[PDB]
């Protein structure tokens, strides 16, 4: 049988602002330019359908997605269960970032997306250039002094790096809301572990030296034709669970077409390679460019420098899942034992890695608590 469970959701083919206006919310596009030339397309929802107060003074909430994802991560479902829309209706001026390399931040001033140099970056550069550039842009635009930073996965990784090496930037973050925080990955539980322990050499032999898993036409075929049909349905949902952990009943099966037609959103092979070094070393450190000389040219050292969570003094609230296979409890716990200004920690036992952005009960489990916390800030 395997018949289409539902007619293709319109969001499947919309870009960020299309989805926002699709739900009746105000959408605004902008693009940041990183010191090193990358052009990042960022989006904003100035007010919500339910709150238009203090226009021009609304507190800023910046949501940063993680590896191979995009800003849609925060507006992937309904207005009542998608963080971005909720923050809007809660009275916030919501900004959604996009990391270099993804669907909407894949353009540089100096290099061609088809050049090797273009994809010669990892989350190091996202922390060092993407964030400063994006946050600086938002605050100069809105006129606010600080903003509320919410990150997910690698979205928190770049936040840890920046806010701990950039004293000036850090001072502009009201509270750091980290969902499925990732500083190290030496205890991840997902099968995709091993693909990360393969020698760098082989990794590049397999994938290449440029783009990594971006959105293809075929991704759309599977998205609209496989993730929408009755039983073949499970191929999509289980591919997601093998990566994030199991919480089968929290995922809206009627929206897999939306999720997979937007994820992955691509990134550099280097970035995934950097994460690979992380899975192997089990440490939290900068990228190894592959030679004392190249690292010299980057760190003035022979070995990339280690990142210190102990120097990340921004008040941080953490939410991690007991069933997350990426931001596993063990790595998260080591991360919590270092953070100097932990203001909050809530471990949601059944939560997996994707729940933080798509769990049908995310509002009650996490979002409402974030709204509450940001409200008394
Ligand atoms: C957490 C936000 C989503 C991140 C991107 C998930 C991509 C899901 O897509 C899956 O990716 C797997 C690994 O590449 C593949 O094995 C599967 O074939 C593919 O369907
Ligand atoms: P987050 O940004 C997780 C994003 C999920 C993308 C899935 C990629 C699969 C590769 C993982 C292999 C272990 O954290 C990034 C840390 C991943 C190491
Ligand atoms: C999204 O779609 C709208 C309308 O088609 C278009 O104006 C806008 O440029 C698109 N955004 C991006 C970044 O592609
Ligand atoms: C959101 O709206 C859907 C659709 O009616 C509803 O089923 C769900 O329970 C709502 N969730 C929340 C947290 O409001
Ligand atoms: C699941 O997604 C479908 C399609 O968008 C929607 O009609 C339904 O209300 C959603 N259910 C929940 C619990 O959000
Ligand atoms: C972490 O602290 C050590 C202490 O000397 C320092 O050498 C290192 O550079 C710090 N990490 C960064 C990159 O700030």
From Swiss-Prot:
Enzyme class: hydrolase
E.C. number(s) listed in UniProt: 3.1.1.3
Residue ranges annotated for the AB hydrolase-1 domain, each copy included: 63-358
One GO cellular component, as annotated: extracellular region
Reactions catalysed: a triacylglycerol + H2O = a diacylglycerol + a fatty acid + H(+); 1,2,3-tri-(9Z-octadecenoyl)-glycerol + H2O = 1,2-di-(9Z-octadecenoyl)-sn-glycerol + (9Z)-octadecenoate + H(+); 1,2,3-trioctanoylglycerol + H2O = 1,2-dioctanoyl-sn-glycerol + octanoate + H(+)
An individual GO BP term: lipid catabolic process
Disulfide bonds: 227-236
Protein's cellular compartments: Secreted
Tissue specificity annotation: Expressed in the mucous pit cells of gastric glands (at protein level). Expressed in the fundic and pyloric mucosa.
Residues carrying a glycan: 15, 80, 252, 308
GO molecular function: triacylglycerol lipase activity
InterPro entries per the UniProt record, alphabetical: AB_hydrolase_1 (IPR000073), AB_hydrolase_fold (IPR029058), Lipase_euk (IPR025483)
Pfam families: Abhydrolase_1
Activity's dependence on pH: Optimum pH is 6 for short chain and medium-chain triacylglycerol and 4 for long-chain triacylglycerol. Inactivated when pH is below 1.5.
Alphabetical keyword list: Disulfide bond, Glycoprotein, Hydrolase, Lipid degradation, Lipid metabolism, Secreted, Signal
Regulation: Inactivated by thiol reagents 5,5'- dithiobis(2-nitrobenzoic acid) and 4,4'-dithiopyridine.
UniProt-annotated catalytic positions: 153 (nucleophile), 324 (charge relay system), 353 (charge relay system)
Major localization listed first in the record, in broad terms: secreted
Task of the protein: Catalyzes the hydrolysis of triacylglycerols to yield free fatty acids, diacylglycerol, monoacylglycerol, and glycerol. Shows a preferential hydrolysis at the sn-3 position of triacylglycerol.
Family: Belongs to the AB hydrolase superfamily. Lipase family.
Name of the protein described by the UniProt record: Gastric triacylglycerol lipase
Provenance organism: Canis lupus familiaris (Dog)
């Amino acid at each position: 049988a395997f018949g289409k469970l539902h007619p293709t959701n319109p969001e499947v083919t919309m870009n960020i602002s299309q989805m926002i206006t699709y739900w009746g919310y105000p959408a605004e596009e902008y693009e940041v330019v990183t010191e090193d030339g990358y052009i990042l397309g960022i989006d904003r929802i100035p007010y919500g359908r339910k709150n238009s107060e203090n226009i021009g003074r609304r507190p800023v909430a910046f949501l940063q997605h993680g590896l191979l994802a995009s800003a849609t991560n925060w507006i992937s479902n309904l207005p009542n269960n998608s963080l971005a829309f909720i923050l809007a209706d809660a009275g916030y001026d919501v900004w959604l970032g996009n990391s270099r390399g993804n669907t909407w931040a894949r353009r540089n001033l100096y290099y061609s997306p088809d050049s090797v140099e273009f994809w010669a970056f990892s989350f190091d550069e996202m922390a060092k250039y993407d964030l400063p550039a994006t946050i600086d842009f938002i605050l100069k635009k809105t006129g606010q002094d600080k903003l509320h930073y919410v990150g997910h996965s690698q979205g928190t990784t770049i936040g840890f790096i920046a806010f701990s090496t950039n004293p000036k930037l850090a001072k502009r973050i009201k509270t750091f809301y980290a969902l499925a925080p990732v500083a190290t990955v030496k205890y991840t539980e997902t099968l995709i572990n091993k693909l990360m322990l393969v020698p760098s050499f082989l990794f590049k032999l397999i994938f290449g030296n440029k783009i990594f898993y971006p959105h293809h036409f075929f991704d759309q075929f599977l998205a609209t034709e496989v993730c929408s049909r009755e039983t073949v349905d499970l191929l999509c949902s289980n591919a997601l669970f093998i990566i994030c952990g199991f919480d089968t009943m929290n995922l809206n099966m009627s929206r897999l077409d939306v999720y997979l037609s937007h994820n992955p959103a691509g990134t550099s092979v280097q970035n995934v390679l950097h994460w690979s070094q992380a899975v192997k070393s089990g440490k939290f450190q900068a990228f190894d460019w592959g030679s004392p000389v190249q690292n010299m040219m980057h760190y003035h050292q022979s070995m990339p420098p280690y990142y210190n969570l102990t120097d990340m003094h921004v008040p941080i609230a953490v939410w991690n899942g007991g069933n997350d296979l990426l931001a596993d409890p063990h790595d998260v716990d080591l991360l919590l034992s270092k953070l100097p200004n932990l203001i909050y920690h809530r471990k949601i036992p059944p939560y997996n890695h994707l729940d933080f952005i798509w769990a049908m009960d995310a509002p009650q489990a996490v979002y409402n608590e974030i709204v509450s916390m940001m409200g008394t800030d």
